[PDB]
Amino acid sequence: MEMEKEFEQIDKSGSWAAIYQDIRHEASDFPSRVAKLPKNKNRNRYRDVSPFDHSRIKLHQEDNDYINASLIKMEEAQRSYILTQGPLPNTVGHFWEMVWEQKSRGVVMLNRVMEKGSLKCAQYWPQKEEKEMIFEDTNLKLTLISEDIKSYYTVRQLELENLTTQETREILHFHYTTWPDFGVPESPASFLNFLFKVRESGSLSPEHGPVVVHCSAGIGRSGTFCLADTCLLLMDKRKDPSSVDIKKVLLEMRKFRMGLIQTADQLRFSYLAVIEGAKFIMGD
Template sequence: ILKEKIQLSLRPEKEKKQEIHLSPLPLPTSQSKTTSSMVQPEQTPKVVNVVVDPQGQCVPELKPPLCASPSPFRMKPVGLQERRGSNVSLTLDMSSLGSVEPFVTVPTPREKVAMEYLQSAGRILTRQQLRDAVACSHLLQTEFMEIPMNFVDPKEIDIPSHGTKNRYKTILPNPLSRVYLKPKNPADSLSTYINANYIRGYGGKEKAFIATQGPMINTVNDFWQMVWQEDSPVIVMITKLKEKNEKCVLYWPEKRGIYGKVEVLVNSVQECKNYTIRQLTIKQGSQSRSVKHYWYTSWPDHKTPDSAQPLLQLMLDVEEDRVESPGRGPVIVHCSAGIGRTGCFIATAIGCQQLKEEGVVDALSIVCQLRVDRGGMVQTSEQYEFVHHALSLYESRLSAEAVQ
C-alpha cells in the first residue's frame, strides 16, 4: 500500500511535463477559415493582425475577428521527447467558463475536436503577408503550437509485432492512409506493414507523396518492395546515416544489390553542392524501371538549415522529375522518423505550387492536411518558420521572374 501511495504521489509530477492545455485562444490570423470551437467563451476575443512597420518591427493591430469561433487549442512548447512523438496527454482548461464545479467533460471527444481543427483551420497569406509573417517569428510559433499533432495510439494498429518494424516506437503510420505492402501470403499481416503513409499534394491530389521512416536493417527489403509496388520515380532522403545515433541504414548498393525480389543497379552518381544524385535502375522479373535517388545531407540534426536555398533547389529539381514522369507513382520522401524534415520538404513543395498557381499560400492549412495523413508532420516551431522562409524565398524568385 505504501508503495502504491508513493507511486500515486509521484505520478502527477511526472505527467505534468507532458500536458498540453487546450483553452480558447484566437488564432493570430489575418484571414481564416471557420474553425469549430470546443467551448464558447463569454466574450469574443479580438484577433491580432500584425503589420511590419518601415523599421522592420512587428506592430500588432487589433481587428474584429473574421470568424466567431476561436481555436480551442493552445499548446505548450514541446521538448525533444514530444517532438519524437511521445504519447502526449491532453487536458482541458475550463477557466474561461467561469466557475465550473465540478469539472465536467466537454461534449465532443478531443480526437473529434482535433480532427475538425485539422480539417478546417487555415490562414491564406498574400505575398506581402507572407513576407510580414516571416518577419514575426513569435507569431508563427504561436500559430504552430495551436496545431494538434495527431499522433497514432499503438492500439489503433492491429498487427502483432509491428513494433519490430518501427524506428521510433511512438511514431506510427496513421491507419487510414498507411501504405499496405502486397505480400505473397496476405494472411501474414506483418508482411503488409511498413511505417509509411500516402500524403495528399496540392489541391488534395491523392497519393502525391509517400512519407516514411529511414529504412532499418530489417525493413530494407520492405522499402524496395514499396518503391516497386508504388512505381515511384523519385526517392528523397533528408538525413545522414548517423547523427549521434543511427538515423537510417545504407539501403542501396555501391553498384548492384538484390533486396528481396527487387534488384537495384546504380548507373551513375552525381555530387552536387548540397546533395548527391544517383540514377538507379530497379528490376523485378523481366521488368525494369528508372528511379532517381536524391540524398540531401546538409540539414543539421534537430535544427533547421541556415539557408532555405538548398532545400528549395532540391524541391525544384524533384518537381521537375515528377513532371517528366507522368503516370508514375508518388514521390517517396524520408528522413529518420519521416515527419520532421520530411514534413518540411513536402509542405514547401505544396506551398510553392500554391504560390505559383494562385499567388497566395496557406501554410497553416497545408501542415494541417499533412498531419491528417501522418501525425506530427513538421515537428517543431523552428521547422514551421523554416517552411515560411522557404516559401518566401520562392515568392521572391517568382517576383523576380515576373519583373524580367
C-alpha cells in the same frame, strides 16, 4: 494575410513556440491500430511515430502487409507524396517492394546514414556499381548505375529489377546531404535549389507513382519538403497567391500522417522557404 507580414509579426513578437503549439493542439487524431500490433514491433523505428490506418501504404503480400509509410494526397494542388521512416535492417526489402508496387520514379532522402554519432537509417542502396544488392525476402535486385556528387546534394541513378518477372525500372535517388546535425539551415537557398532539381526530374509529376520521401522518422525534414512544395504550387495555381495559408496546408497534411514539422524552428524555416521561393513562382 500575406505570409511575409505574418512572418515579421511572429518574429518581432517572438511567438513561434505559441504558433506551433496551436498547430499541435488542433491536429487530427486517427487510429494507428495496425502499427501497434505485436508482430510489427521491429518494423517501427520510433514508438511514438506511426502511420494512421486510413492512409497507410499496404504491401502486396498476404503474410504481413505492414510498412511505416503514409500516402499524403493533396487534392487542390494535385500532388501526392509517400512519407516514410528511414529503413531499418529488417525493412530494407519492404522499402524497395513499396517503391516497386507504387510505381514511384524518385526517392528523396533528407538525412545522413550516421548523424550525431548514431545510425539514423540502414545503408539501403549500393555504393559501388560492381557490388549490387539482392533482397531475398522480396525478390528484388538493386544496382548503382551512376552517381553525381554536388556540394549540397548527390543524385544517383539506380536500376530496380523484379526478379520474379525480370522487368526493370530506373529509379532516381535525390540525397540532400547538408542538413545540420542540430537545428535548421540558416538560409533556404540550397534546400529550394534541391526541391527544384527533384521537380525538374519528373519524379513529382502525375505520370509516375508518388515520390517516396524520408528522413529518420519521416515527419520533420520530410514534412518541410512536402509543405514547401505544395504551398509553392498553390501560389502558382490560384488567382490570389497571398491567399495561401501555410498553417492551414500543414493541418491538411496532418490528416494523413502525424507529427509533420517537429519543432518551432522547422515551422519558421518552412515559412522562410516558401517566402523566398515565391520570388521565382511569381515570375522571376
